[PDB]
Design a binder for this molecule. Sequence first.
Ligand code: FMN
Ligand code: 4D3
Ligand code: MG
Ligand code: NA
Length: 397
Amino acid sequence: SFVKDFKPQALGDTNLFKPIKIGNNELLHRAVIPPLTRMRALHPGNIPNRDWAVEYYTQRAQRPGTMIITEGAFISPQAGGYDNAPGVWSEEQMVEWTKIFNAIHEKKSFVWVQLAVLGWAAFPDNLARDGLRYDSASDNVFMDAEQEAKAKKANNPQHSLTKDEIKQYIKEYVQAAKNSIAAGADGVEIHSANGYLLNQFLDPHSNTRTDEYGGSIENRARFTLEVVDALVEAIGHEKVGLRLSPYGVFNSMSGGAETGIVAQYAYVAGELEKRAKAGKRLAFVHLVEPRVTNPFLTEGEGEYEGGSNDFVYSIWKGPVIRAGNFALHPEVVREEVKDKRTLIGYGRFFISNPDLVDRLEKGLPLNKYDRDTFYQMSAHGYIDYPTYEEALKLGWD
Ligand SMILES: Cc1cc2nc3c(=O)[nH]c(=O)nc-3n(C[C@H](O)[C@H](O)[C@H](O)COP(=O)(O)O)c2cc1C
Ligand SMILES: COC(=O)/C=C(\C#N)c1ccc(F)cc1
Ligand SMILES: [Mg+2]
Ligand code: NA
């Protein structure tokens, strides 16, 4: 059914419906599909779902000129640890990704692969089964008690990465980016948000290292910036974006409680602008808003009111995608898109509305989402959410 009490607003008269160029892509509107893990990939081999994934992305590519960022994709087996999330390291995987990218392009839309590395968010037992380490920045602080225990039971204690192991990850990032572009993707997004590996290095709670990769703002940012630089060299700045969540607490990141958090992220933005001014500007910076500090809490919950991402705009001068509880708040979007380099990512409501862009333009009701099927091995709650036309025919009005 449709969301009750929601009062839609037509946003067609705003910059949300003004074209913009991101990297090589001429977007026709500024409603972006942010990365959304769905767990339909099949085991073994972390293979994008052979039955449904093409259809899922085809549905959500239906509005011409839409920018789609894929679900997170593991750069290597060591970067993984969830059996049902996809990778981008193997030929078997790329066969399916190629079909997905082709389908998106047939609809005249665009696709950027998010490159994922779990660190302490991985399941230590899956990794142990596969002969892999359980990795993070440090070895004396853990995501939670349950993960620490899981790791110990599996004889796979949380491991603080050596410099060589960091270089190996960078090698894998480079190859994954190459794989993505060769298979037809328009670009890649480096995930450095939401408490996964790169975020675990950025955050002083999770990073207690005393070498060059921790112990200061510059040191904590080192790994993220090394990945940025490696990918810019490999496939070009116009094919690379970076995702950050300064105020996120998901996966045991610090958020606003850490008084140094804005400085940490301001430094990263500054380093990106420095590179931009020296001729290598990333295609975009993607920010999760303090509106959503944990994406598994219902909209309105876990909102941090003590911080704003606006600081980034004083530093980074390129496009900014902002995501977090915007679907239910057209009044907020109307104000944010007055800034002419701002795009809006819509996550949960793109899960439930394949034709979300039409609905935003025209001020239509939104399909309610079913959180139970966010992660599920099913077509149900994946490819059977109706368009507005289909919903009317089903009598949802
Ligand atoms: C089911 C689900 C899966 C997600 N998967 C990813 C992901 O793979 N990578 C990522 O950076 N963010 C991921 N996110 C976070 C979203 O991209 C987004 O920032 C968040 O849901 C807030 O936006 P929203 O309120 O419009 O949903 C996920 C969120 C949800 C609910
Ligand atoms: C392969 O990438 C993933 O598995 C990503 C997530 C999971 N699970 C993920 C990343 C960011 C979020 F905000 C939520 C889930
Ligand atoms: Mg778009
Ligand atoms: Na889960």
